[PDB]
Amino acid sequence: MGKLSEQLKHCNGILKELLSKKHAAYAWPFYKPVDASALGLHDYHDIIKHPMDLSTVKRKMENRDYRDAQEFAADVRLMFSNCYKYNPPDHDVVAMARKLQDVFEFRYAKMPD
Numbered sequence: 751m752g753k754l755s756e757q758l759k760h761c762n763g764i765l766k767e768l769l770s771k772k773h774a775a776y777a778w779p780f781y782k783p784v785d786a787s788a789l790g791l792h793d794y795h796d797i798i799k800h801p802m803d804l805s806t807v808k809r810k811m812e813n814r815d816y817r818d819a820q821e822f823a824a825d826v827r828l829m830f831s832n833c834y835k836y837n838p839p840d841h842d843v844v845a846m847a848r849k850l851q852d853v854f855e856f857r858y859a860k861m862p863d
């Protein structure tokens with residue numbers, strides 16, 4: 751029950767919230783890796799070097815891959831950054847990213863010290 755454990759429990763709580771029915775209307779594009787081929791996005795992997803999605807964050811959390819809150823937050827923000835890099839700012843998925851990042855940032859800010 752040390753500080754790192756406690757901070758990663760807060761991260762795990764946020765992760766569960768981002769995956770919850772409450773946010774499903776705007777979270778769903780981030781549930782699984784972007785299927786570039788299926789979506790016809792044949793330039794996706796040329797523009798996005800480091801893909802990230804919530805299923806990958808969940809696997810890394812379950813595998814105890816994250817050693818601290820900062821490492822977890824870096825993956826969640828990489829996921830949003832990839833969305834803002836690849837997509838025109840007027841696309842629905844960017845509006846959805848902004849809304850889910852608002853949920854993330856406000857709760858991440860309530861990290862226990």
Ligand SMILES: CNC(=O)c1cc(C(=O)N[C@H]2[C@@H]3COC[C@@H]32)cc2c1O[C@H](CF)[C@H]2c1ccccc1
Binds near residue numbers: 779789836838843846
């Ligand atoms: C992280 N997800 C994505 O970046 C993403 C990109 C595109 C896309 O087609 N992006 C291309 C825009 C126009 O050309 C470059 C960018 C489409 C969708 C995406 O997530 C959903 C699939 F999970 C799918 C979606 C469908 C309808 C509404 C919202 C989201």
